[PDB]
Design a protein around this nucleic acid. Structure first.
Lengths: 134, 400, 59
RNA sequence: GGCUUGUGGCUGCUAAGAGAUCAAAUCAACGCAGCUUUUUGAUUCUUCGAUGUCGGCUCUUCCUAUCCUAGUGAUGUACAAGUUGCUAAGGGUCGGAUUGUUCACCCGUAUUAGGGAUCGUGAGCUGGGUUUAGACCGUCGUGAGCCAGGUUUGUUUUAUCCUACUGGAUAUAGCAUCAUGAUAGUAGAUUGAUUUAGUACGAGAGGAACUGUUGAUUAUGGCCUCUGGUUAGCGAUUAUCGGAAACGGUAUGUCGCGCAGCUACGCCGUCUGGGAUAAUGGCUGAAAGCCUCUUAAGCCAGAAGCCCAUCUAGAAAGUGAUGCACUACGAAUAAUGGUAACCCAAUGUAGAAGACAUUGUGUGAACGAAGGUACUGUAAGCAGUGGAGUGGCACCACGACCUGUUGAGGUUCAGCUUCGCUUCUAGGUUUC
RNA sequence: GUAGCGAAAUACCUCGUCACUUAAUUAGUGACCUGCAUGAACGGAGCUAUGAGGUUCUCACUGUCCCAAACUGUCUCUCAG
RNA sequence: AGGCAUGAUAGUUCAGGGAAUUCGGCCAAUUAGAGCUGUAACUUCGGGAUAAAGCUUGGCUCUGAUGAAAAUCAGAACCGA
RNA sequence: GUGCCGAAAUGUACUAUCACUGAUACCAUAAAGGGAGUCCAUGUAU
RNA sequence: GAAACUCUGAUGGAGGACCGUACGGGUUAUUGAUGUGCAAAUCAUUUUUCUGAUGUAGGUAAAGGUGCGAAAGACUCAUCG
């Protein structure tokens, strides 16, 4: 709901059951991703998140309060390379996401590590608190 | 359902049969409907595919995310030498189809055109073709035939061929009158010209026979057929790959690893009844070398070719030639060219016939501002560090 | 134009790649050759073909 | 499989009432009449000198009794979400957990139907189940043994034949180029956000739409500029062998980087308007001095559907243009020898063989040169007030390595580009 | 039918009921016991060690898979016999 | 003798994910030798145990200890991808 | 059985029919129930 | 240590112990290759055992409603309820 915008078709790096790190201090060490939100059916195709994708996750390792529940993530760093239309090709050192509520407000206070450009350019609340955008 | 699952069809059904085309150039199926009125204005034109670069455009789209931002875009570059009109045809309308009402020819004919009517030029002693040189028959005959085209023929098309061009042999120094002259080939090899015919979409028929007779025995250039910002259809034969398996040809899912007699196949050809393999089923055969059209290819810039200022853009104030330093599989490109946006069908060295698009876009990408900041001229073998030779001496002036 | 992290050469737009490091380094690279030698923590002061070699190696 | 349709599934006719009031917006009893072969029965016509038997995987096509998309009508239709009728099968209809499952049932997503083709599909696979011989448990039996009771280990053969299909050739009534285009196929389909708009409508809560812009998913055709994958070209290195090094072998060597080529995880295109219809809505207008879309003549508007436009193949549709070569109106019908090709020789724009393409006195090939271009990464050998040190003579021995010569040396079309008379280029058989 | 054991390699009804295991479990583990048809040398309960034995989960690692692709050796292709 | 497309079979390698494939991690990948640390529940006290989990390993110039011994073990410099 | 395939009258005389529909025993299917479609028609009233 | 004895290190080399070689003995998996085979039971990779209830050679004993059987109705010259 709190996207304001859309993607530009990057290379998708994170198929289902890709466990990734969580940037936020909410208390999710990891995030086993279940499905991407806004994805159509196709026979034998695993649905695959890139950056700036509203994803369904379970926190697997973290606080006992959070885990063994379904939650909405969003992907921030991808590791797998992708081509911006500018011409530059960019990847990060690690896969990482952050948890959000149903409204599209960020649950944790602040980000550890960098964020991608189109994650900030799309989602305002992740841009509003991040140490560096790239 | 009975299939047990739903999944789209593998492969298109409209591009059958997937086999070889023996056309050397892009055979045009259908020309655009004549507006009528206006001017006849030629339509189609041949260009050889020279190679490919990319370019850094600066974009102006209102109400999009790339408003006033740079955008890297691949660009094919077709070389187009200026081609020579020879003949002129009519076509009468009949109940069966369009049937021809005779071709008129020019006064003389260049020996590039004579190559077409032999398979063995090197054997031929006589080399007697187009013996229309006789004075009595040719002069009287054309004015009879040009009268018959006004009477019957509605549609008029202009026969035209590519300039192979002329040169001097080996170590004779050129630009001298005693030296024997001879046909230089293309970047491919060939001296035999690609003859086409080109429909003239100018109203009145009679009006056309002013224009198509004015243009006759004169070279056409690209700058008075296409213009920058035009959407163009590229017609040509694609890239030959020989025989192919069922997996790579139609793009099917291959089987389990545990299969006896291997997994690179479609498993069920068909059902018990009907007792027969269907045309629709995927199967082993030819891949590539297929004749294709493709629609709505933009042309970014049109060339000309000592200043060699063609490669460079408005900015920078440094002049760069279009050929990347080091020239692969082609040649330099010392002719008129076309920076076409994106891919074009076929390999390097292939004759692509261009054509004006049959019906008009209303899409805003069609009527966009082109504005190139800067173009690549780095070598393609393989990673290129220097755009120009000039950069080299400055970067590493002292060597050995 | 972007100057590289490893090697220290120029290269122009629509080439190479970028690896965004932890601790927010935007390091551009010439090729996979330059990227791969960085990834194994090798010095440009020892590898001969590079340009950051040839400053401190006196040419 | 066939016949049959009790049973299963689907649909009519009638209304006795539910539905606040009111049978027919929507449900529908008690009854009555049908359709279907996607359930299971019933039967024993075919098959016992054998049609390989369940499910899943993979690919095709077909049916509509339509869930979505296209277009329409009803309403207890204000909006939105719904319930429901009609035309429509072009396109779409899914990722997973347990189970041999079909089926079922949950988690999750782009809203979400069900079927047929020998219960499609075993010389296409798999063999989990079912259904042999080993073995165990439980009930039954004096016992051998039994058990739609459970559990575990248990061999899946052959295409080289004829058709079918896929691509590619060859014979005819010259040789070659350029065209026509009967016929056959056909491709784009969906969707988010934004604008219209917090507007219409509504007491409020909430909350649309045509059109335009702008992205995405999926399918499809094409491409290699970049990026990623791959890579006997260079470098490094283990054991051993060539007296040492050099340069090599062997372990189909190991590691590092890697042009070209292919390839996707990359990149580009998918524009666009007709005609006649299906449902249905209208106009004029009788039958029926009123009234009616025709239930009459005539006219208009009208679907992702059908046919055209576009795109793929194409004259054994045995065709045609150009070059050479040897005997009569019309309209209504409630009216007037010598060419040439092929062999051959290369080449690649291509290729299983054929074929296709280009050249054959020309930088065509082979070699060579480029402050042309690439890849590797500083050759060997020599020199050094270089070098942890050890040993000897009165500064010389041995020394991984480092500095200099040295972005050096090696490789660079084999499918890379420029120009160079350095070197080389011959024969054979039919065809009208 | 004592002691143990008990929807078990035995439990048809049955995917029994309630926890743990999972985002999701007809599987796995632990309890309850109306044991269709458990039970003591017809041997009962037990698992330290051993097992090319049966079965469930976690970490590591992977072309099994998303989704295929490239290269290499011998054959398949052509010719002679 | 000549070709090198497709396919079968035996092999190296594969971005990002890491069993989502499948009846089932079948297959392959990871691990690995030695030296120095360090080793749990449970146990028939023998085992478990190479449990698990860490580190080091080259080349070259030396030094020292134990033997008779031309061997073997310990320690330190310096060197580069 | 008699338009043509197909041998034999698209025969003469007399009534019905517009529907993506109908068409010759056994026979290769269709019902209950509807229709100001059209033709023929029973009894009454104005 | 008052005693009965029990702490540390070496010595020693026991065990139907363990890892692991073969032209040794077996034959688990890939349900790989082959299945018009090299073969009327083979080949490759993987796997099990390897001083013993071990393997193996020659001579010799047991014969068809019999023999022999660490027992599968196994084997008794490609033949066995």
């Amino acid at each position: 709901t709190g996207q304001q915008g859309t993607k530009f078709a990057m290379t998708a790096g994170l198929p289902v059951g890709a466990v990734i790190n969580c940037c936020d201090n909410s208390g999710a060490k990891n995030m086993f991703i279940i499905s991407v939100r806004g994805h159509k059916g196709r026979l034998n195709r695993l649905p695959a998140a890139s950056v700036s994708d509203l994803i369904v996750v379970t926190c697997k390792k973290g606080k006992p309060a959070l885990r063994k529940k379904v939650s909405m993530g969003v992907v921030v760093r991808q590791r797998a390379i992708w081509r911006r239309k500018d011409g530059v090709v960019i990847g990060f050192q690690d896969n990482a996401g952050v948890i959000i509520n149903d409204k599209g407000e960020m649950k944790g206070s602040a980000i550890t590590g960098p964020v991608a450009k189109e994650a900030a350019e799309l989602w305002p609340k992740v841009a509003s608190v991040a140490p560096a955008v790239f | 359902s009975h299939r047990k699952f739903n999944a789209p069809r593998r492969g298109s059904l409209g591009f059958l049969p997937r086999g070889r085309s023996h056309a050397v150039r892009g055979r045009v199926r259908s020309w655009p409907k004549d507006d009528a009125s206006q001017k006849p204005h030629l339509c189609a034109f041949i260009g050889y595919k020279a190679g490919m670069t990319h370019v850094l455009r600066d974009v102006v789209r209102p109400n999009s995310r790339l408003h006033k931002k740079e955008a890297c875009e691949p660009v094919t570059i077709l070389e187009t030498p200026p081609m020579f009109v020879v003949g002129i045809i009519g076509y009468k309308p009949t109940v069966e189809g369009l049937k021809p009402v005779t071709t008129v020819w020019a006064s003389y004919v260049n020996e590039e055109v004579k190559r077409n009517y032999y398979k063995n030029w090197y054997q031929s002693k006589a080399r007697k073709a187009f013996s229309c040189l006789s004075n009595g028959k040719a002069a009287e005959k054309r004015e009879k035939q040009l009268e018959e085209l006004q009477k019957e023929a509605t549609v008029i098309r202009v026969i035209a061929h590519t300039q192979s061009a002329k040169t001097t042999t080996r170590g004779v120094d050129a630009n001298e009158q005693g030296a024997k002259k001879v046909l230089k080939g293309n970047h491919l090899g060939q001296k035999k010209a690609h003859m086409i015919e080109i429909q003239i979409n100018g109203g009145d028929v009679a009006a056309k026979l002013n224009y198509a007779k004015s243009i006759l025995e004169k070279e056409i250039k690209v700058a008075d057929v296409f213009t920058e910002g035009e959407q163009i259809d590229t017609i040509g034969v694609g890239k030959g790959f020989g025989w192919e398996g069922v997996i790579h040809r139609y793009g099917t899912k291959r089987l389990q690893k545990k299969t006896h007699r291997g997994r690179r196949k479609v498993a069920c050809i068909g059902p018990w009844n009907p007792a027969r393999v269907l045309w629709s089923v995927a199967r082993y055969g030819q891949r590539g070398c297929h004749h294709r059209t493709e629609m709505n290819k933009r042309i970014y810039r049109i060339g000309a070719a000592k200043i060699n200022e063609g490669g460079s853009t408005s900015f920078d104030l440094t002049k760069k030639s279009i050929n990347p330093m080091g020239g692969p599989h082609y040649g330099l490109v010392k002719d008129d060219f076309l920076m076409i946006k994106g891919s074009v069908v076929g390999t390097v060295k292939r004759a692509i016939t261009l054509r004006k698009t049959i019906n008009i876009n209303t899409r805003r990408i069609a009527t966009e501002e082109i504005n190139l900041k800067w173009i690549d001229t780095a070598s393609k073998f393989g990673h290129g560090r220097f755009q120009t030779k000039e950069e080299r001496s400055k970067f590493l002036g002292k060597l050995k | 134009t972007e100057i590289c992290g490893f090697s220290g050469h120029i290269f122009h737009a629509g080439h190479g790649r970028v690896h965004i490091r932890e601790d927010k380094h935007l390091m551009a690279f010439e090729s996979r050759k330059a990227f791969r030698m960085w990834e194994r923590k090798r010095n440009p002061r020892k590898i001969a073909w590079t340009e950051h070699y040839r400053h401190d190696h006196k040419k």
